Amino acid sequence: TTYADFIASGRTGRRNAI
Amino acid sequence: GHMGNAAAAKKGSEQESVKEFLAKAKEEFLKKWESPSQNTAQLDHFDRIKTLGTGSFGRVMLVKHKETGNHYAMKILDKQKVVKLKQIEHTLNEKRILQAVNFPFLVKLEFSFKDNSNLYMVMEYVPGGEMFSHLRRIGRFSEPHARFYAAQIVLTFEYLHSLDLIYRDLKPENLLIDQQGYIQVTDFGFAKRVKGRTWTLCGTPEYLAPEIILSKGYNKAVDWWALGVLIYEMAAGYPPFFADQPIQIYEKIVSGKVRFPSHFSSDLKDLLRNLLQVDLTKRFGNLKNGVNDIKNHKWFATTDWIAIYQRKVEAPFIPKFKGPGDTSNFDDYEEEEIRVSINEKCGKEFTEF
């Protein structure tokens, strides 16, 4: 699923600016 | 046409009244921008209670004012680290913006001061925590719940853009929920006064507009792109463009393709296709009709914009609040001491603070 792909990205926590 | 006489007249008058409001708000902002305040409290006026969050050159603590008993959020910045990380202009700019703006969804700066080691910004305490935490816990917000928040961002950007300010770092991590369930925007480190174009590569990967990725001169339309990303993530539970590495996220952003969950309404998809529009000559918020293309879209047909501004709409969600100084909606951090040197550091670089 798309949700599963989101989990697999490893970017589910808080995101810092570049 | 789509509107009869009565509705068209009411909508026309409403848009003219918004113009009148913004003209007065700009006059008030410019007076405060030209004459900023300085040194309005000192460190021993507060008791330190708990750390609410931290960055690479400072932290934010819950404090209690000794004389009044009021709680506040005190941002402490280490002057030496601010210099080493090349954040002098950003830090001075954030404080100058915060002391000059006034809007119900922008956090209020109550005091600021400095000492030998640190800079201090004392803001109202927003006890409900970050939207980010609530979104990850609940999973996703229903479309009415997402729309309630989105309407507040539309009004806040309409205000900021009228002052020629571009925000540039919208995301759920930067949106706090207050005791009545409304939004507070707190951080302005990347905001800039821009009447025309600007060129800095800045923001967060998932929320970057294509024209930033492609190294173009860009304008306030990047904030309306980021609004599309935010509405999508609120309603789906995940953002429209994600991958293991930022470079692959950027490939997706510039591609002009976006996919939607099957539970998204057709009205929502139409709004998002017009906000997540790679072609600047077609992006909502960037056309001749300005913000009105967004406010008059079908997905917002049930939104009473004045009632949102007046905070008279019942919020879909009220965070748990056991009392003043409740911190249960915030992460836990390890507490480090606040050392103040016997020697002034970086006095020349922060003279205007």
Smallest Cα–Cα separation from B290: which of B154, B92, B103, B185? B154
Does residue B217 sit within a domain?
yes
Asked whether residue B153 falls in the same domain as residue B64, the answer is no
Asked whether residue B167 falls in the same domain as residue B251, the answer is yes
Q: What are B144's two structure tokens? A: 């009415």
Q: Which residues of B touch A3 (CB under 8 A)?
A: 237-238
Asked if A15 lies within 8 A of B259 by C-beta distance, the reply is: no
Query: Under DSSP, is residue A14 helix (H, G, I), strand (E, B) or coil?
Result: coil
CA quadruple A18, B55, B146, B303: dihedral positive or negative?
negative
Count how many pairs of residues, chain A against chain B, have C-beta atoms within 8 Å: 39
Q: Which residues of B touch A5 (CB under 8 A)?
A: 242
C-beta contacts of B311-314 below 8 A and 24+ residues apart: B311/B104, B311/B180, B311/B182, B313/B148
Q: Which residues of B touch A17 (CB under 8 A)?
A: 169, 190, 202-204
Asked whether residue B285 falls in the same domain as residue B173, the answer is yes
Asked whether residue B125 falls in the same domain as residue B139, the answer is no
Does residue B13 sit within a domain?
no
Asked whether residue B99 falls in the same domain as residue B193, the answer is no
Local structure of residue A13 (DSSP, 8 states): S
Q: Is B190 on the interface with A (CB under 8 A)?
A: yes
Q: How far is A11 from chain B (nearest CA, A)?
A: 7
| Binding-site residue ranges of B for ATP | 52-60, 75, 124-130, 171-174
Contact B183, B105 (CB under 8 A): yes
Burial of B233 by CB count in 10 Å (0-12 exposed, 13-18 middle, 19+ buried)?
buried
Q: Which residues of B touch A15 (CB under 8 A)?
A: 171, 173, 204-206
Does residue B165 sit within a domain?
yes
Asked whether residue B156 falls in the same domain as residue B265, the answer is yes
CATH number at residue B310: 1.10.510.10
Asked if A6 lies within 8 A of B238 by C-beta distance, the reply is: yes
Distance CA(B219)–CA(B52), nearest Å, equals: 33
Tally of structural domains, chain B: 2
Q: What are B197's two structure tokens? A: 């174009």
Smallest Cα–Cα separation from B285: which of B208, B217, B225? B225
Contact B212, B256 (CB under 8 A): no
Burial of B330 by CB count in 10 Å (0-12 exposed, 13-18 middle, 19+ buried)?
buried
Distance CA(B160)–CA(B150), nearest Å, equals: 15
Strands B175-177 and B109-114: unpaired
Asked whether residue B214 falls in the same domain as residue B116, the answer is no
- Give residue B178's domain range: 18-35+130-320
- The neighbouring-strand residues paired with B113 are B120
Asked whether residue B203 falls in the same domain as residue B84, the answer is no
Residue B346's φ and ψ, nearest 5 degrees, are 60, 35
Q: How far is B242 from chain A (nearest CA, A)?
A: 7
Distance CA(B120)–CA(B114), nearest Å, equals: 6
| H, E, C per residue of chain B | CCCCHHHHHHHHHHHHHHHHHHHHHHHHHHHHHHCCCCCCCCHHHEEEEEEEEECCCEEEEEEEECCCCCEEEEEEEEHHHHHHCCCHHHHHHHHHHHHHCCCCCECCEEEEEECCCEEEEEEECCCCCEHHHHHHHHCCCCHHHHHHHHHHHHHHHHHHHHCCEECCCCCHHHEEECCCCCEEECCCCCCEECCCCECCCCCCHHHCCHHHHCCCCECCHHHHHHHHHHHHHHHHCCCCCCCCCHHHHHHHHHCCCCCCCCCCCHHHHHHHHHHCCCCCCCCCCCCCCCCHHHHCCHHHCCCCHHHHHCCCCCCCCCCCCCCCCCCCCCCCCCCCCCCCCCCCCCCCCCCCC
Amino acid identity of residue B244, one-letter, is D
CA distances from B75 to B25, B59, B118 (A): 27, 6, 10
Q: By CA distance, what is B207's nearest residue in A?
A: A17
Asked whether residue B196 falls in the same domain as residue B266, the answer is yes
Q: Is B138 on the interface with A (CB under 8 A)?
A: no
Q: Which residues of A touch B206 (CB under 8 A)?
A: 11, 15
Does residue B116 sit within a domain?
yes
Asked if B238 lies within 8 A of A3 by C-beta distance, the reply is: yes
Asked whether residue B101 falls in the same domain as residue B246, the answer is no
Does residue B7 sit within a domain?
no
Smallest Cα–Cα separation from B174: which of B120, B243, B229? B229
Asked whether residue B85 falls in the same domain as residue B217, the answer is no
Q: What's the resolution in A? A: 1.7
Smallest Cα–Cα separation from B206: which of A2, A3, A1, A6? A6
Contact B68, B91 (CB under 8 A): no
Distance CA(B154)–CA(B286), nearest Å, equals: 13
Smallest Cα–Cα separation from B164: which of B95, B100, B227? B100
Q: Which residues of B are catalytic?
A: 169
Asked if A18 lies within 8 A of B201 by C-beta distance, the reply is: yes
Q: How far is A1 from chain B (nearest CA, A)?
A: 10
Q: Is B21 on the interface with A (CB under 8 A)?
A: no
For the packed helices B5-34 and B88-100, what is the interaxial angle rounded to 10 degrees? 120
Distance CA(B61)–CA(B80), nearest Å, equals: 19
Asked whether residue B145 falls in the same domain as residue B274, the answer is yes
Distance CA(B75)–CA(B82), nearest Å, equals: 13
Asked if B205 lies within 8 A of A2 by C-beta distance, the reply is: no
Asked if A6 lies within 8 A of B246 by C-beta distance, the reply is: no
Residue B136, CB half-sphere, CA atoms under 13 Å: how many?
12
**Residues of A numbered 1-18 whose beta carbons fall under 8 angstroms of chain B's beta carbons: which are they?**
2-3, 5-6, 8-12, 14-18
Does residue B43 sit within a domain?
yes
Amino acid identity of residue B48, one-letter, is R
Asked if A17 lies within 8 A of B203 by C-beta distance, the reply is: yes
Smallest Cα–Cα separation from B109: which of B123, B130, B120? B123
Residues B55, B57, B61: CA angle, nearest 5 degrees: 60
CATH number at residue B65: 3.30.200.20
